[PDB]
Design a protein around this nucleic acid. Structure first.
Lengths: 106, 66, 109, 248, 51
DNA sequence: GGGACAAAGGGCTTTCAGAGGAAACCCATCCG
DNA sequence: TTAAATAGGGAAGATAAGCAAAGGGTTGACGAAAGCCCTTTGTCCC
RNA sequence: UUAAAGAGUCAACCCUUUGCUUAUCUUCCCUAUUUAAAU
């Protein structure tokens, strides 16, 4: 058995619908891209790293690393431009997260 | 530079006019989510979901001339 | 050879936490599946990746904050990030739970 | 109607299927006109008209209730509750393969245009999607109306969009005439005063709403006049075809 | 543990459930050998446990 | 040290409201 | 290693009887706009 | 150019029963002939 990508679709005649392209099983591009950026090894604990995201969290596991303990994307971004520079791990994380797209505001 | 926005009359008018004309070539979208009472007044009362036109074009069937 | 999907119907029991008096009834579900044919024993997954530059270029706003951030950055080592991004593809993390049950995984890049 | 360039069998994944609040599916002709304008401004070559044909298209999901894409926490207002299933704000996606024809006014050479187009396509987007693959572009020359049929037939096989006009409104025409609406332009409502959060402080800003027109899908070999299958910018912020309303 | 073919449902609400034993195992008192083997066997088999 | 304002963050939260509904479409040619 | 020359008309295609019952169709996650309180930082006054 | 951004994931016994069947006429008719040296 092979495991193609699934979809979140409102209730229909099926209970589990798999992604396909003209009758052929395929995988979503978001799923392919998520596994590439799983390099966030630069926090305090939790070996077997996770994907780089602002407020780095794993909703599947229900836990959110890089919480309100003075290690965030926005805190480091504000601190880098306001004088004092960061350590090697902090810049390597900020640049890696900036490579990933997104809109930041609030 | 333009900022597109939606029209309130079109959604309600099209939904009401098309639900009774049997046009089975449309999607269905629901706004708000788990608590749709904080978006608009039409979404709060029309919880069934607004209707959208399905603009899928015909596709070139393969293994033949066209 | 392309792999189709197909649809099947399964029957079983009702095992839901908090509902003990309704566990003696049946359950009928309709699902999709996907598996290799009985004459083939190898799954081939093919795709493409594109890497582009022009980093530190904001798409919305930024006339002094973006320039200050760019000046503060660019001293980091991109070699480690590039090594890790390529390794996540070469080692075989891009392919999910299809990984298990395989005695040999080959990657052609 | 002198120089045309053809790019056929272009694969794009992740196309934003939501063009308006009531239209989900193919991008309107405005998207392709904007792509042509972007090519003209970036490359420095004047482009007159754009034609698009749908080889394949499929909206992700089922017959109804297309799909929902999972969202992520990316704003600076959270951190405590930003650990479980951010809200939705739905945004449909689709996958399609198209074919494009561009009217070009360039006479310096014959092979440089292919290279300059291929350079731009490798880094371009179609309604937010990513281009997977495409064929090598080729150039056709038309001197009169009779040989326009040849450059038209060079686009086989695909389905081209033609304009049929609106009679009363899209809602009544769709049920009766059995056609599909499309966005052809925007109508301005009122001018933006505060220019703080806008992406440009020099370009005047406006609030606009889409204007709807009814279109049809026709085989390339069944098109009477090729001028009815080319779109370009018009007056009063609209997109119009050279041949006007299509008539058999 | 039920047999829909026979219409009877063993391991009913009489203090022998997968969820009851699994909940009690982490909350202090452990289980017996047969209970541990049952929980491990039911974990080898898939399913959803939450609500 | 006391008073006022703003921002950031969390929590005490918590306030707010509410059952419609029915069904598989568009369309046949260039080229070696 | 052959030139031509034609290849049937007519009739006609059956009827009756019946197509089963019973059981079941899962759960969990995807909110905005405030009120109050506390803490910290920064500005100003006393 | 409605530009910019985003992991759907996990689990399943479809089982049991059976009589298709009775009848039958395909008949009549017919000109295939006309040659030439072995390469």
């Amino acid at each position: 058995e092979v495991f193609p990508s699934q979809e979140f679709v409102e209730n229909s005649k099926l209970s589990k619908q798999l992604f396909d392209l003209n009758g052929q099983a395929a995988m979503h591009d978001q799923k392919i891209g998520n596994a590439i950026r799983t390099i966030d090894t630069w926090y305090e604990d939790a070996t077997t790293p996770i994907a780089v995201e602002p407020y780095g969290s794993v909703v599947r596991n229900g836990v959110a690393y890089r919480a309100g303990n003075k290690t965030d994307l926005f805190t480091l971004m504000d601190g880098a431009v306001n004088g004092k520079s960061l350590t090697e791990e902090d810049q390597m994380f900020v640049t890696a997260n900036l490579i990933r797209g997104g809109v930041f505001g609030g | 530079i333009l900022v597109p926005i939606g029209n309130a009359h079109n959604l309600i008018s099209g939904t009401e006019y098309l639900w009774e004309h049997k046009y089975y070539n449309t999607f269905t979208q629901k706004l708000g989510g788990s608590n749709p009472q904080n978006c608009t007044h039409a979404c709060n009362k029309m919880r069934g979901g607004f209707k959208q036109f399905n603009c899928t074009p015909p596709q070139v069937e393969d293994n033949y001339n066209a | 050879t392309a792999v189709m999907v197909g649809t099947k119907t399964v029957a079983g029991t009702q095992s839901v936490r908090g509902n003990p008096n309704d566990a003696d009834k049946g359950n009928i579900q309709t699902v999709n599946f996907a598996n290799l044919p009985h004459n083939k024993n190898t799954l081939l997954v093919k795709y493409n990746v594109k890497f582009v530059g022009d980093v530190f270029k904001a798409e919305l706003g930024g006339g002094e904050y973006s320039n200050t951030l760019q000046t503060a950055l660019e001293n980091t080592d991109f070699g480690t990030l590039a090594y890790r991004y390529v390794y996540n593809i070469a080692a075989g993390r891009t392919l999910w739970r299809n990984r298990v049950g395989a005695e040999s995984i080959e990657t052609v890049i | 109607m002198r120089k045309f360039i053809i790019v056929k069998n272009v694969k794009v994944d992740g196309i934003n299927a939501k063009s308006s609040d009531i239209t989900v599916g193919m991008p309107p002709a405005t998207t392709f006109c904007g792509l042509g304008e972007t090519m003209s401004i970036k490359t420095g070559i004047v482009v007159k008209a754009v034609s698009y044909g749908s080889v394949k298209f499929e909206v992700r999901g089922s017959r109804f209730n297309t799909s929902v894409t999972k969202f992520a926490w990316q704003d600076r207002g959270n951190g405590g509750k930003a650990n479980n299933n951010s809200p939705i704000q739905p945004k449909p996606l689709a996958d399609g393969v198209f074919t494009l024809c561009f009217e070009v006014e360039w006479e310096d050479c014959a092979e440089v245009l292919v290279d300059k187009v291929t350079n731009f396509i490798n880094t371009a987007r179609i309604a937010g999607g990513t281009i997977a693959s495409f064929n090598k572009p080729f150039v056709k020359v038309a001197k009169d109306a009779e040989e326009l049929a040849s450059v038209k037939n060079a686009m086989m096989p695909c389905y081209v969009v033609v304009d049929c006009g609106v009679e009363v409104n899209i809602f009544e025409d769709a049920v009766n005439r059995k056609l599909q609406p499309m966005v052809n332009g925007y109508k301005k409502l009122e001018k933006i005063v505060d220019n703080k959060h806008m992406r440009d402080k020099f370009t005047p800003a406006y609030l606009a709403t889409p204007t709807y027109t009814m279109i049809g899908y026709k085989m390339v070999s069944n098109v009477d006049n090729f001028d009815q299958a080319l779109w370009q910018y018009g007056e009063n912020t609209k997109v119009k075809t050279i041949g006007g309303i299509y008539n058999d």
